């Protein structure tokens, strides 16, 4: 009956693994979006070069 | 406020060279009786500690090269073995971190 | 708060201190000639 917390990296930390996990956070924000409108909104709202 | 008069070199010398401001001679230095380097009593021989940190760093570099990436703290003990040292009968089931130089005399 | 009265602008700088503005009036030609006499190597802005 071992409740081991998961083996994941941290969210708020300033490293590379934290950056990847925040990438997964917004990608899971789009996976859990039902309208194609919102999927395209979230998947293109950040304007970069 | 502000000074009313310059202070002479005499007063400044009686302040700057007062004993309370001098650097005290340290009564607790000696020589590592075996190793023969300077040290304070309550502190580690600096040369010995450096020669230990070098080996710790080399061992840890091997550990990193073997564990691959981050988040890989093993769940078993670890033993480090130098050249021509077969894993002893007590160290089976413990991760081995091979090194390629003769074991230091100070490593027991 | 003061001290930032110079908000640079190339159009303004070339319009109100430039070669053509000096040469568009006798006073400006006098200015250019003074600065030619004193030896300057920056006659006009």
């Amino acid at each position: 009956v071992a409740r081991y917390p998961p083996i994941v990296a941290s969210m708020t930390a300033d490293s590379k693994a934290a950056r990847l996990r925040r990438i997964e956070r917004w990608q899971a924000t789009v996976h859990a979006a039902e309208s194609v409108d919102e999927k395209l909104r979230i998947l293109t709202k950040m304007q970069f070069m | 406020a502000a000074p009313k008069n310059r202070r002479t070199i005499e007063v400044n010398r009686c302040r700057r060279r007062n004993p309370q401001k001098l650097i005290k001679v340290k009564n607790n230095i000696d020589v590592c009786p075996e190793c023969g380097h300077l040290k304070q009593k309550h502190v580690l021989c600096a040369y010995c500690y450096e020669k230990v940190c070098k080996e710790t760093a080399e061992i840890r570099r091997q550990i990193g090269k073997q564990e691959g990436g981050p988040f890989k703290a093993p769940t078993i003990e670890t033993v480090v073995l130098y050249t021509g040292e077969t894993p002893s009968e007590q160290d089976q089931g413990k991760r081995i971190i091979e090194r390629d130089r003769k074991r230091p005399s100070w490593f027991t | 708060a003061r001290g930032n009265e110079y908000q640079p602008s190339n159009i303004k700088r070339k319009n109100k201190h430039g070669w053509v503005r000096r040469l568009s009036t006798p006073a400006g030609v006098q200015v250019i000639l003074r600065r030619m006499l004193k030896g300057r190597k920056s006659l006009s802005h």
């Binding site: 081991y4 083996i7 | 502190v43 580690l44 500690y49 890989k72 703290a73 078993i76 480090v80 027991t108 | -």
Partner: protein, 152 residues
């Protein structure tokens, strides 16, 4: 006045103090030996000891699991705590960590300290031995050992 206050003051407040000590303790559990400023290590030694105490209770206990969840930040170390450290000290009932002072830091000349968990694999710290038992004063004291033992 600060009579009977056992906790140092460090960081930007109490919370930052707990977080600093938490990072030190995580580094200690991950590498089993760390060099840090002396006062911070002296503050963290008690926490490392009690962490091993909580880890002895074992995985099944939930209070210990929550505590080790808070006090370890990269969770790969929580296995270790409950399967390499706490088992290692099944015999010792106290004093799992040794703390030494080392040459002051080059840059800011702070008072340093190496702290490690007893029994690790690393090359051993150059501990200071006592005087050999065969020295003059020790020999005279050994003679007194004998002569007092026979009398009693």
């Amino acid at each position: 006045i600060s009579h009977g206050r056992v906790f140092r003051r460090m960081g930007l407040g109490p919370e930052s103090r707990i977080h600093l000590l938490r990072n030190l303790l995580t580094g200690l559990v991950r590498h089993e030996r760390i060099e840090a400023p002396w006062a911070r290590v002296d503050e963290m030694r008690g926490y490392a000891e009690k962490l091993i105490d909580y880890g002895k209770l074992g995985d099944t206990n939930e209070r210990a699991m929550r505590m080790a969840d808070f006090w370890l930040t990269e969770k790969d170390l929580i296995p270790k705590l409950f399967q390499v450290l706490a088992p290692r000290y099944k015999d010792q009932t106290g004093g799992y960590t040794r703390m030494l002072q080392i040459p002051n830091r080059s840059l800011d000349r702070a008072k340093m300290a190496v702290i490690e968990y007893k029994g690790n694999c690393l090359p051993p710290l150059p501990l200071p031995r006592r005087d050999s038992h065969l020295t003059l004063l020790n020999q005279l004291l050994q003679g007194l050992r004998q002569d007092l033992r026979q009398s009693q």
